């Protein structure tokens with residue numbers, strides 16, 4: 001069992017969101033096994049990988065957060081070797097490590113906005129209407145396949161603050177009409 005490896009990143013700053021791949025699937029074996037990753041981290045959102053699966057991780061308040069169902073209890077690879085998890089909550093599906101040096105963190109939202117935006121692993125930014133503490137509705141339904149690999153990514157408010165971490169798709173016969181997320185307030189409670 002190896003470390004989670006950063007294989008890309010998503011930029012949310014400036015005027016244009018974009019994805020950049022920094023490491024190929026072939027291969028992350030050495031980095032996985034050793035937990036030593038030479039690459040200097042950038043950006044707010046990391047594209048991360050285990051042996052055969054990819055997902056996202058988001059820096060908020062100096063902690064790099066992701067989903068347990070992706071990371072498990074794994075360390076994350078870094079230039080100084082494997083980094084042990086700071087936070088682990090299986091009930092919430094939540095993992096956090098100390099944010100990598102050179103990372104930019106998002107600020108938790110206190111706007112109270114109903115209009116949210118989900119950032120996918122391809123750096124698509126899709127509108128979500130908030131509908132409860134941990135739920136939002138997609139304005140356009142999407143096959144679940146479209147959202148697979150985007151867990152751990154941010155839901156943002158219009159000003160680009162973090163509102164939550166994408167956890168699960170609300171699936172009706174293989175089609176997502178809504179998304180379930182870990183709200184930033186819940187991240188705060190975990191940090192208590």
Ligand SMILES: C=C[C@@H]1C[C@]1(NC(=O)[C@@H]1C[C@@H](Oc2ncc(OC)c3ccc(Cl)cc23)CN1C(=O)[C@@H](NC(=O)OC(C)(C)C)C(C)(C)C)C(=O)NS(=O)(=O)C1CC1
Pocket residue numbers: 053054055056067068069070090091092093094144145147148149150151166167168169170171180
């Ligand atoms: C389609 C894209 C969705 C965003 C995505 N997440 C999913 O697949 C999640 C995983 C799983 O949920 C949970 N696991 C473990 C938990 O704890 C450890 C949970 C604790 C609390 C809650 Cl809430 C959920 C938990 C089931 N699930 C669904 O989304 C499921 N939906 C779901 O369960 O919906 C309800 C929550 C509303 C029931 C289903 C599979 C049916 C869509 C993804 O992309 N993953 S991934 O590919 O990146 C993978 C990391 C590599």
Ligand SMILES: [Cl-]
Pocket residue numbers: 005006007022023031037039
């Ligand atoms: Cl890397």
Ligand SMILES: [Zn+2]
Pocket residue numbers: 109110111112113157158159160161
């Ligand atoms: Zn806000």
